[PDB]
């Protein structure tokens, strides 16, 4: 069933306009591409840490 695919939306932005195609590393442009649709995959993405726990260096 998958836990949703974390790499659904990001992949598109990663190649286009992302120095280093990695989250939680060069995370800036990916951020918006990510949190948008990857909110569902928050479990996997570890969004900051959960969400309200807005830990910068996730």
How many CB atoms are closer than 10 A to CB 10? 23
- Torsion of Cα atoms, 51 then 33 then 42 then 11, to 10°: -150
- Listed in sequence order, the residues at least 6 apart from 50 whose beta carbon sits closer than 8 Å to its beta carbon are 42
| Domain CATH for 44 | 1.20.1400.10
Give the residue from 27, 32, 29 showing the smallest Cα distance to 55: 27
Domain that holds residue 21: 1-58
Q: How many domains does the chain have?
A: 1
């Amino acid at each position: 069933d998958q836990n949703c695919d974390i790499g659904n939306i990001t992949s598109q932005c990663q190649m286009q306009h992302k120095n280093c195609e990695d989250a939680n590393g060069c995370d800036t442009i990916i951020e918006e591409c990510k949190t948008s649709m990857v909110e569902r995959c928050q479990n996997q993405e570890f969004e900051s840490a959960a969400g309200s726990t807005t830990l910068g260096p996730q």
